[PDB]
Ligand binder design. Sequence first.
Ligand SMILES: O=C(Nc1ccnn1-c1ccccc1)c1nc(C2CC2)ccc1Nc1cncnc1
Ligand SMILES: [Mg+2]
Ligand SMILES: [Zn+2]
Length: 313
Amino acid sequence: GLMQFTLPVRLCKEIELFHFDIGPFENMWPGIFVYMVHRSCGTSCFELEKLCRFIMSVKKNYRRVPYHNWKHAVTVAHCMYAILQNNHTLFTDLERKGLLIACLCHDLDHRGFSNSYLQKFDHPLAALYSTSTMEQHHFSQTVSILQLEGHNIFSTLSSSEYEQVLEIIRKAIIATDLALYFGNRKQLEEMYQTGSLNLNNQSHRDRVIGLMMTACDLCSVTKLWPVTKLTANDIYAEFWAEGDEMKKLGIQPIPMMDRDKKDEVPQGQLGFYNAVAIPCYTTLTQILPPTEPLLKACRDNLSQWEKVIRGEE
Ligand SMILES: O=C(Nc1ccnn1-c1ccccc1)c1nc(C2CC2)ccc1Nc1cncnc1
Ligand SMILES: [Mg+2]
Ligand SMILES: [Zn+2]
């Protein structure tokens, strides 16, 4: 009850900022997550014993892949923490509870392969879940861990509150399917510009939480250049492995996934920032003005990639 988590001074201060990097000490990441739940949600919203047991089972169910790993889960949870702390009064008690858990759980048991690769491989998951294949799996793994003995962190919620928080988590996790992002942002763009956006309309809240999930999921493009540049290596290590696996199925992969086409990466990053990242954080900043630092940092990294292309690095 009276056991507060405290970080060292530099972490205590920098964890409040959007561009925070959780660092290379894996054993500190659980403590960083609990610190964020305690400050974002309250020291009372979860039983520490159950939360700790839930976190360690979630960690165990992330795989040792270069990018879609435990460090990604905690990085995505921190971006959501920063959005929630900078938007204190906008979110319900169940939303703050659900969204940090959704972020920690959003890539559970990821193998380093796209929905596309699972479909062309004819993986059993592609037969069980025809769209948002990996994301339905991620939600399924979240529910499985919630049902382990002593792992029900929501046990004190009513039956109807419990159903609400699991529906927040399901929608939040499904929304990390980037295929769903493009249409969601377009609709939010139109709703904002025609002035019909209404945060009391549950269907509107869902869309806005969806965009927050994309923003948090992509937040490696909102870090200081040295972090962004080194994280880019980890994402391409996954892409090039999937490309190898495409070649093994007798399919020439898209250039993004072909390791014979590393030279095209800088131009590929421009397209990604212009088509995906900048529009995401732009629309997010229009809806939630205090998330402007994510857009600013994103624009900084686009400019760094333009400098790479012009041979200035
Ligand atoms: O770079 C990414 N994608 C990409 C490169 C070239 N074209 N595209 C592209 C275009 C349209 C749709 C999907 C992909 C990327 N993707 C993802 C998600 C989509 C899996 C997450 C992070 C990403 N980048 C990155 C991460 N951390 C540090 N720096 C950069
Ligand atoms: Mg994912
Ligand atoms: Zn993710």
